[PDB]
């Protein structure tokens, strides 16, 4: 799992 910030928006992606 990686914590991502896209133009301020947060999400977690897990591979």
């Amino acid at each position, epitope marked *: *799992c*990686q*914590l991502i*910030n896209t*133009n*301020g*928006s*947060w999400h*977690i992606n*897990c591979k």
Partner: antibody
Amino acid sequence: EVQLLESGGGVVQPGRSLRLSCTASGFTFNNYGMHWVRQTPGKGLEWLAVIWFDENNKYYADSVRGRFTISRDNSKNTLFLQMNSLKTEDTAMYYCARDISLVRDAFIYFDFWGLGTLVTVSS
Amino acid sequence: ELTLTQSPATLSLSPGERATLSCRASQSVSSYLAWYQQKPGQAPRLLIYDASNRATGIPARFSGSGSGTDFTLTISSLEPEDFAVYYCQQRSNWITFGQGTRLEIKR
């Protein structure tokens, strides 16, 4: 009992460095995101940095990006904030804080905070 | 980018009364909102997250509601330990906090 204890604060002059430690106990440290948050009487609470499960996965506020560095040593259950090129307006109480870290439900919320360590930047 | 504005700045009440605290966001944050309590010389404490989800160990007299831009923390019946400073916090876009509502003793 979850516990977070910050140390390293003190008096330093503008332009100097300081490094904060945050010792964690009572939970599995490496399973949680961790943050630094500061507070001043003048402008309240300000989030500074986050480090997630992977120790190279970090984000910072604009006002400290590139001057401060968040890191964690999971074998020592310790969180750090390296504060370079300090300015008088970095004077604050610095809080260690744990992220609720529920990937399925809620995250980027601070479910436990430390006691805080005081940083005074002044000529 | 998103400012949280809290009102009133100071709320003056007595033990047993209902307390209603407001937080307004400058743009919609959906439900990504949390409330914190802080007493002098102590750290904040998490009360509510995701606007209405009561954190573990928080008494039932604390409740949160709202979505979009308008939120409220309700303390149904105040106890003396509830007199303190309260902050809302947003995580829809980066992370920001309101400036706090101070809960003080009416006399």
